[PDB]
Amino acid sequence: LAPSIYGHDHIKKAILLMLMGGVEKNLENGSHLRGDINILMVGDPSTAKSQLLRFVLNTASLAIATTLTAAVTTDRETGERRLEAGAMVLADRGVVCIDEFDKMTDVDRVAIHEVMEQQTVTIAKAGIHTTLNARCSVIAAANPVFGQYDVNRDPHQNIALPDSLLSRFDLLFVVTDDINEIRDRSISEHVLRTHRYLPPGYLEGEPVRERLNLSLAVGPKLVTIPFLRKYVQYAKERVIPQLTQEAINVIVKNYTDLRNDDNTKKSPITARTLETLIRLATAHAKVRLSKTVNKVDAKVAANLLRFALLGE
Amino acid sequence: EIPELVPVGEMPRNLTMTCDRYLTNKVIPGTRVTIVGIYSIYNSKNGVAIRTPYIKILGIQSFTEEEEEEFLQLSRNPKLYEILTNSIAPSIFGNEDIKKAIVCLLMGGSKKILPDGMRLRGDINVLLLGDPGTAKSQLLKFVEKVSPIAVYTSGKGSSAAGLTASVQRDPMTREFYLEGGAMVLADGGVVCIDEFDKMRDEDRVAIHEAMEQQTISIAKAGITTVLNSRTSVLAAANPIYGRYDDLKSPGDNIDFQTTILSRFDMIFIVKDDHNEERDISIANHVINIHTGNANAMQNQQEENGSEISIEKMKRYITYCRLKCAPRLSPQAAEKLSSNFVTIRKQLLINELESTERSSIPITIRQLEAIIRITESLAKLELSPIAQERHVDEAIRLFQASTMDAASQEIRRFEQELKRRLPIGWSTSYQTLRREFVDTQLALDKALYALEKHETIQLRHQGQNIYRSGV
Amino acid sequence: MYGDLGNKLVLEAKRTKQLYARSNQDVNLPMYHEDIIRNILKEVSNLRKNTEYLKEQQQLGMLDDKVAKCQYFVTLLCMERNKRCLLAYQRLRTDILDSMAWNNNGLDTNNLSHQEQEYLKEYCDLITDLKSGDLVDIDLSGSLVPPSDVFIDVRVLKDAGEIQTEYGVFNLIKDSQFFVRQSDVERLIQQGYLQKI
Amino acid sequence: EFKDPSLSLVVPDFLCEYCFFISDIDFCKAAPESIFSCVRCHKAFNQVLLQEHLIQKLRSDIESYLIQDLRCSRCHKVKRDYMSAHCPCAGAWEGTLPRESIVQKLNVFKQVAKYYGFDILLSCIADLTI
Amino acid sequence: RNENFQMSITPIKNLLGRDAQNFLLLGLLNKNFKGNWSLEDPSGSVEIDISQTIPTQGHYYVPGCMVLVEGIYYSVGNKFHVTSMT
Amino acid sequence: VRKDPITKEWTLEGGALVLADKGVCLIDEFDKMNDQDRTSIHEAMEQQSISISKAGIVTTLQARCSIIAAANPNGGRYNSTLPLAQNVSLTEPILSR
Amino acid sequence: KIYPKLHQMDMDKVSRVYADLRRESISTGSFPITVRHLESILRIAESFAKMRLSEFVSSYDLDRAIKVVVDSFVDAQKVSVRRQLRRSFAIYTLGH
Amino acid sequence: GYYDIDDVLADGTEFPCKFQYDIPGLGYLENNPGRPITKNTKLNLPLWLARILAIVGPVPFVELLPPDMFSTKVMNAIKTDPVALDLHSINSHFFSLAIKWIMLFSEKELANVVSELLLQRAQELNHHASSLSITNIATSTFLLKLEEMEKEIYKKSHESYKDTKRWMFKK
Numbered sequence A: 001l002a003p004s005i006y007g008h009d010h011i012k013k014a015i016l017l018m019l020m021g022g023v024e025k026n027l028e029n030g031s032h033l034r035g036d037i038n039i040l041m042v043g044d045p046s047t048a049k050s051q052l053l054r055f056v057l058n059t060a061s062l063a064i065a066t067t068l069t070a071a072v073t074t075d076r077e078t079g080e081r082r083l084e085a086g087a088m089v090l091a092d093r094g095v096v097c098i099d100e101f102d103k104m105t106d107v108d109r110v111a112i113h114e115v116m117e118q119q120t121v122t123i124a125k126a127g128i129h130t131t132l133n134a135r136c137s138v139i140a141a142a143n144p145v146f147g148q149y150d151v152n153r154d155p156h157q158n159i160a161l162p163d164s165l166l167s168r169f170d171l172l173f174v175v176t177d178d179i180n181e182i183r184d185r186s187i188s189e190h191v192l193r194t195h196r197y198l199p200p201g202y203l204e205g206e207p208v209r210e211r212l213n214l215s216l217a218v219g220p221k222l223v224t225i226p227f228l229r230k231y232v233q234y235a236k237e238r239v240i241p242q243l244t245q246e247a248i249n250v251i252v253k254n255y256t257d258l259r260n261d262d263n264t265k266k267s268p269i270t271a272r273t274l275e276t277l278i279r280l281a282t283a284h285a286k287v288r289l290s291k292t293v294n295k296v297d298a299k300v301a302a303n304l305l306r307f308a309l310l311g312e
Numbered sequence B: 001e002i003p004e005l006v007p008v009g010e011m012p013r014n015l016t017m018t019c020d021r022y023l024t025n026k027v028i029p030g031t032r033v034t035i036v037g038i039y040s041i042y043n044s045k046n047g048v049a050i051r052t053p054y055i056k057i058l059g060i061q062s063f064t065e066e067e068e069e070e071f072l073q074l075s076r077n078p079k080l081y082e083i084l085t086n087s088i089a090p091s092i093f094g095n096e097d098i099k100k101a102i103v104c105l106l107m108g109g110s111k112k113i114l115p116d117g118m119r120l121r122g123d124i125n126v127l128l129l130g131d132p133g134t135a136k137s138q139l140l141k142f143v144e145k146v147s148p149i150a151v152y153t154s155g156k157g158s159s160a161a162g163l164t165a166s167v168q169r170d171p172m173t174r175e176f177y178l179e180g181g182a183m184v185l186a187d188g189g190v191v192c193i194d195e196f197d198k199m200r201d202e203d204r205v206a207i208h209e210a211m212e213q214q215t216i217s218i219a220k221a222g223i224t225t226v227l228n229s230r231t232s233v234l235a236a237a238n239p240i241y242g243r244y245d246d247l248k249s250p251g252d253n254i255d256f257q258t259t260i261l262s263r264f265d266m267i268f269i270v271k272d273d274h275n276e277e278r279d280i281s282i283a284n285h286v287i288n289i290h291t292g293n294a295n296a297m298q299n300q301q302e303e304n305g306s307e308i309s310i311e312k313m314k315r316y317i318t319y320c321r322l323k324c325a326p327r328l329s330p331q332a333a334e335k336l337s338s339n340f341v342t343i344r345k346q347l348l349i350n351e352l353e354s355t356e357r358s359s360i361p362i363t364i365r366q367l368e369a370i371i372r373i374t375e376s377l378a379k380l381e382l383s384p385i386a387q388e389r390h391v392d393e394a395i396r397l398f399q400a401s402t403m404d405a406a407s408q409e410i411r412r413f414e415q416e417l418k419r420r421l422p423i424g425w426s427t428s429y430q431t432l433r434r435e436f437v438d439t440q441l442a443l444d445k446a447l448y449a450l451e452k453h454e455t456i457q458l459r460h461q462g463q464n465i466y467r468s469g470v
Numbered sequence C: 001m002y003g004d005l006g007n008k009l010v011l012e013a014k015r016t017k018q019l020y021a022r023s024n025q026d027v028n029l030p031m032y033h034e035d036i037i038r039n040i041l042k043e044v045s046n047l048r049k050n051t052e053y054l055k056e057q058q059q060l061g062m063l064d065d066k067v068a069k070c071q072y073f074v075t076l077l078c079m080e081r082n083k084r085c086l087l088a089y090q091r092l093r094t095d096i097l098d099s100m101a102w103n104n105n106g107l108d109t110n111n112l113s114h115q116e117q118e119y120l121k122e123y124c125d126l127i128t129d130l131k132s133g134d135l136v137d138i139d140l141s142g143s144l145v146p147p148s149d150v151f152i153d154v155r156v157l158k159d160a161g162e163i164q165t166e167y168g169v170f171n172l173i174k175d176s177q178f179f180v181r182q183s184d185v186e187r188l189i190q191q192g193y194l195q196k197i
Numbered sequence D: 001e002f003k004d005p006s007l008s009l010v011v012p013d014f015l016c017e018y019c020f021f022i023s024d025i026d027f028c029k030a031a032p033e034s035i036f037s038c039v040r041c042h043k044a045f046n047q048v049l050l051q052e053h054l055i056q057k058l059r060s061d062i063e064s065y066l067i068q069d070l071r072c073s074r075c076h077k078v079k080r081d082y083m084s085a086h087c088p089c090a091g092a093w094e095g096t097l098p099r100e101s102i103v104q105k106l107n108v109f110k111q112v113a114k115y116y117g118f119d120i121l122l123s124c125i126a127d128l129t130i
Numbered sequence E: 001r002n003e004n005f006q007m008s009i010t011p012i013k014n015l016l017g018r019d020a021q022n023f024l025l026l027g028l029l030n031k032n033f034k035g036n037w038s039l040e041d042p043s044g045s046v047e048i049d050i051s052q053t054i055p056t057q058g059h060y061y062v063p064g065c066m067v068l069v070e071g072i073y074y075s076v077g078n079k080f081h082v083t084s085m086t
Numbered sequence F: 001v002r003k004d005p006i007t008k009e010w011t012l013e014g015g016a017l018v019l020a021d022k023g024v025c026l027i028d029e030f031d032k033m034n035d036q037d038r039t040s041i042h043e044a045m046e047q048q049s050i051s052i053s054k055a056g057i058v059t060t061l062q063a064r065c066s067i068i069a070a071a072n073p074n075g076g077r078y079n080s081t082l083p084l085a086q087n088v089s090l091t092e093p094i095l096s097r
Numbered sequence G: 001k002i003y004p005k006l007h008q009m010d011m012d013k014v015s016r017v018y019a020d021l022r023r024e025s026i027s028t029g030s031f032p033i034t035v036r037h038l039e040s041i042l043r044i045a046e047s048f049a050k051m052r053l054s055e056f057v058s059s060y061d062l063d064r065a066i067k068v069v070v071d072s073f074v075d076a077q078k079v080s081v082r083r084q085l086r087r088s089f090a091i092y093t094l095g096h
Numbered sequence H: 001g002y003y004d005i006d007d008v009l010a011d012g013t014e015f016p017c018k019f020q021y022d023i024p025g026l027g028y029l030e031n032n033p034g035r036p037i038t039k040n041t042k043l044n045l046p047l048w049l050a051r052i053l054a055i056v057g058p059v060p061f062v063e064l065l066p067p068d069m070f071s072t073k074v075m076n077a078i079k080t081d082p083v084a085l086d087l088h089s090i091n092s093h094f095f096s097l098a099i100k101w102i103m104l105f106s107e108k109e110l111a112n113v114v115s116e117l118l119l120q121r122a123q124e125l126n127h128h129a130s131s132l133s134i135t136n137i138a139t140s141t142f143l144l145k146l147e148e149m150e151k152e153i154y155k156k157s158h159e160s161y162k163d164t165k166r167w168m169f170k171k
């Protein structure tokens, strides 16, 4: 994924686990608990975020581009009101890509809780009192509302989004424009080679003509994106991993460690983190194509989650 | 009607008029024209026994094979950049680097298309932020004269509709149509937004797409549409608190967000130096303006070739825009990359020193601005390649503008040095480094503070710290 | 690739030919591109060293009848291409120099290579030999517009004082006007002292 | 406007050995008696000694020009390196002893030499150009 | 013009950000205002570590001398570690 | 600007500084206008023009006015212990005009 | 009907006035002396000449214009400094 | 001719080449001197090189695949509307290159089509060359679509007409 992007290995691993996301749990009486995974990339602008959303959008399938929920709507010619689908409804059992998520308005954010908790959205006007399936795995990205991102302040403080909203996401990354000379040297020379591009047959210094498309209207083992698509398709097609007890032992070990180490002082780690570990370990079992989740999967998932939340 | 013919206190009047066959598409909005036509009448649907007047056009008047030669000769002149720099706002004394940057904004960089169909900005955006009476508005109202396409607005005169585009209902058909705002009317040239700091927040939001995506996306009256806005924003603004306040950060002196500030290829922060010799020079110049000698002075400079006329420069800017689009040489490309990592290292040390992140983001987006300036500088002389000298001047202008916009325990070490080094004697820097570090970057701030005061003077290639003052 | 510098050089050639062709006058030709020519000659030396290296290693003879033959062919064709590009550039600037010799010197110097400076000296010496031996009854370097009129009016555009001609004088007073035989003043029209026709 | 008609040409710490007096003497603003003789005692000064001191001052200023540090013309930092073409703040380099001032110093030296008839100092001034 | 070069020189300003890579320099041998030994180029300057170097023996080496320098650039201290000098 | 009830097109209507073109405009209690009104003065007061861009209309009007303004200092009356910038709420740009 | 001209005005008088006003206006709370205030002197001198129906601006018009502007600046001050400023600028005004 | 600059540039254009052998050392054509070019390597080579490697090798070292500028798409666009076609965008030297290709492989269809193309465009070229001011935007939009070959013919022709009009009406 995204081979042009310097660093960001853990981000790409987390993206792959979301693309291979966790399994749904309908308990007795049909009591529903959500298997899908949700991610948010906070950070500076000019970082990898938006480009990663392009690479995710072009890698995933049933993927919706945004830059929500569901609504009852009307337009100029309609003498009537119609129920409309937002991106999560359109991405039911698919994915949503939300760039500039810090910009979303209040009536949207108030209803995002239903997507995040219940994987559904409820309608409550014009007598259409109903609830819709919106069972997607979301990846979002956001920018500071003022200035460059202050890495000392929380996401709740650098961005207007509430902590009671930001906490819904399984993984919450903060990325920043590190001023590293090796990175800067690399991306600089790539941008310079881009701006030195001369189209075919143009003389040196010749201006590019807008006439083109109508005038010509005469009619390191990294894989290909189609192969990666075919792999994720095969995993979804061929396995639904079962959850083994040794995995559980690693999971409860790591959760209760995270919830009593100094990591508590950084975040009030809670039950959502526990079920997130189960989802991520299940997703790693889907990476393996393995018929079960096992202790090996939990060991990978806890390392990634500890890095994502605490940076270590 | 022509604005300088409107009667005093009148609202400017206008006529609807028609043309057909080979007179269609012969003019664009904003062009000044002479029309020959039949003044005539028609009985519109909308008084009594009244009729709507209109003109049936019979003629319109609004490169030549010798101005081709003139602009070749002017390209061949070695002093061209100084000549154009003098020719921008010639009555305005000083502001040399700002005038140089205005020439770059007028010429623009080179617009590009990639194999993917992706397209890259050629337009430069410049923000002049600074003190009152620094001739900012005068510079914008000059640029609206010389630029072949231009629009002038003021921030408080704006609305989002009158900026991007608006719905209209045509009185002739009596049916809807969409009509362009200031950004669309500036497409292919400069929009001069004067007193930009007074603009409402929703208007400044509406600027974003037209300024960076260079489009306006529309869904109004059921008309879904997207318009093109290839535009240079030349914005002028005062600081918050009126005069620029040196004790405050630029992020405090400026209301604009870091997002919108990033979209300006160059920011100049302009201040009164209050220097007596400068003010005397300005005063002699201003009185020469008012006494009327300036007319003869500019005519002399134009006969001398030290300046060129407005129309000649307008034709020349159009000639450069239509005939040339330079590329960076490989040497220039490497030098630009190295300069990028250099200024990035400089911002890193400044942000560590200030322990605060700058209001100005020196991201990869600003390298695109330096590339764009390099291309414009080569575009003046119609050189098909932008050579290393053009990168030198482009780097000089960026250092003169946006770097100055961005680049804005010791108590113990400074007085230890005051005690240990007496007046009139010299300390070699390397020994001071060893002496203080062995007790540590507070050293060079102590040097900077004691250098700003008269007390210490770096001397002999900076190797000798000389206690020159008190 | 070895031919690219040749393309850049002959693009320079095409542009200077257009620079000369588009204007009505003889435009003084631009600077000799010693830098690109040095790059190409260095490339030729690289190719010569490659042929020497290969022809030495042909005594080891790796599939030489096809492989060494093919390698030798490609590195030889690169040298043929670069010779063509260099000679095209030099032949164009030579043609312009010859044209200028006939148009002026038979009656900007920094931009020439020193070989071109001494070439131009020799070609001017040759022209002046042709209009000095036999055929000297005709100034072979004279105008090629046919003589339209025997007498013309000419306005003095720059002052040159009293000068003689074969049976008289002109006093070239600034902004005086003569009516005179064209064959007695053509030399001064070409030298830019006289204005009309 | 009043500008002082006298350009000072001071020779610092000149010594009268006859009374060990250490005086700065100004060849333009001083009266001629105060140049050619002391002003605590009144013994006369040797002419060749005096011309030698003016030549020492002249060559001191030529050297001080040639060894000067360059300074940035807008941020006033010293040029700390050997091969930059301009300061990193975009400003051009300028001398800390601008050339105009040194031409002025040489001009007062030629005037003083012509007036007092200082043959040796005049030969030195001549041998600079020629 | 010398046959040994036409590896070849990189101007010092090309080094910046090209971490842990071999380079051949040509430089004016400064001693910086901070006191460290240094090379300067029309394009810039870089501090040098000579602690591991092998100089060529038929020469003096003084400040201000133009010296060829081969070594590995290191971004971590922004030093250039000289293999050999001539 | 207003949408003309006859034509249904948008038209400008001049404000005080258009009506007082080539005249003088008199602004009493300048200190107690809203700053979102005061900021409109800047262009006409110095550049002698008003540059509207609204409802499709985009134009520059002439506004050749001398403005004479009357104001009370901060709090209620003058206090000569202070300099001007603390006597009055007005900022340097408008005051410089 | 009347359009005065600044024929042979005292440039250096005005320039020194602007230079000194600018220097004393360095006080960060004072009335912000600016290039448009120099133009104000010239406009005002034209207005006084206009009152005389005068084709040409005299020294007296320009002196009165300077005196008006200098008084306007000098009285825009905290009283702790007004006397010193009055004494300094008196060299320009008390010639008339 | 040898020194003919527009011929030298035409020889500098690139064509798609498929190799018929494995050859060591030629990898510099694939930007790496250290390796062979393999059989069935498909590579764009300059025409001055591709012309010779297409003939010498018995099987030659290279086979020339059909270039896109002579694809059936372009040939169809030629055969509908010669004067509307932007040959300068297709290739700035298309007539010189078509002559060279027609000679390299005897291709009667391409010769007939290129003859028709040139003739039909020659009519319109003469119309714009003959028109004179007392220049039209219609002329300008047509001249943008001319090859360097056609630009040379137009320049020479238009100069002939202009010089004749000058001589007739002026003294």
Ligand SMILES: Nc1ncnc2c1ncn2[C@@H]1O[C@H](COP(=O)(O)OP(=O)(O)NP(=O)(O)O)[C@@H](O)[C@H]1O
Pocket (backbone or CB within 6 Å): B091, B092, B093, B094, B131, B132, B133, B134, B135, B136, B137, B138, B139, B237, B238, B282, B285, B286, F046, F047, F093, G035, G036, G039
């Ligand atoms: N450097 C200068 N040279 C000549 N005239 C100047 C100069 N600076 C200012 N002026 C004059 O002073 C006025 C400047 O007005 P203006 O252009 O509005 O300045 P500004 O930068 O826009 N200040 P503001 O409108 O308060 O933000 C004009 O009348 C100019 O003639």
Ligand SMILES: [Mg+2]
Pocket (backbone or CB within 6 Å): B136, B137, B138, B194, B195, B236
């Ligand atoms: Mg202004």
Ligand SMILES: [Zn+2]
Pocket (backbone or CB within 6 Å): D016, D017, D018, D019, D020, D021, D038, D039, D040, D041, D042, D043
């Ligand atoms: Zn004595």
Ligand SMILES: [Zn+2]
Pocket (backbone or CB within 6 Å): D072, D073, D074, D075, D076, D077, D087, D088, D089, D090, D091
């Ligand atoms: Zn500096």
